[PDB]
């Protein structure tokens, strides 16, 4: 390894991943396998890429004090063990899902998904931007408007009505 220089390197780099980054995912790893790297980086074969990195930098006073790059409310995002996930390129889309449906396979622990930056806030796992390039989902979000919402309710009765 090395000294405070190596530190500064690791931090300025990994938090540059939080400066120019597309998204952020904070995950506590206990019983974290090699099949984990063989999960996120296998999903990096045909879907993701080298555009993704997850380092365990929960070294904290390194990776936290190392955010003059302005990650706030993150002291609370520093408890216990955490594996930082940052995306420089691509959409912020799929990565959140990769972990979301990783940990539910029991896949280590999710830290209850403590939440991370670009909302810049606390813990809840939302559906915001898995759904893009899915815009067929919007093709069905129109719900046909005048037609399918009509064949749901305006024609509901004749099947549900005679009684």
């Amino acid at each position: 390894m090395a000294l405070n220089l190596q530190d500064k390197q690791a931090i300025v780099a990994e938090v540059s991943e939080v400066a120019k980054g597309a998204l952020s995912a904070v995950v506590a790893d206990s019983r974290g396998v090699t099949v984990d790297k063989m999960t996120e980086l296998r999903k990096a074969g045909r879907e993701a890429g080298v555009y993704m990195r997850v380092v365990r930098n929960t070294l904290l006073r390194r990776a936290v004090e190392g955010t003059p790059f302005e990650c706030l409310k993150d002291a609370f995002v520093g408890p216990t063990l955490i594996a930082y996930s940052m995306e420089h390129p691509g959409a912020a889309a799929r990565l959140f899902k990769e972990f979301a449906k990783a940990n539910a396979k029991f896949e280590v622990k999710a830290a209850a998904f403590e939440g991370e930056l670009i909302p810049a806030s606390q813990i809840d796992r939302l559906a915001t931007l898995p759904t893009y390039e899915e815009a067929i989902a919007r093709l069905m979000a129109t719900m046909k408007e005048a037609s399918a919402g009509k064949l749901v309710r305006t024609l509901a009765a004749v099947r549900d009505a005679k009684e």
């Binding site: 046909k144 037609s147 399918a148 064949l151 305006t154 024609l155 009765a157 004749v158 099947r159 005679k162």
Partner: peptide
Amino acid sequence: SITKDQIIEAVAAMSVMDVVELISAMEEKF
């Protein structure tokens, strides 16, 4: 057409006809 016309018809339109109508309109699209 005025909404009240479509509503009046599709509401009344008998029964013996109507259940073979609106159901068929559920058998065309969706």
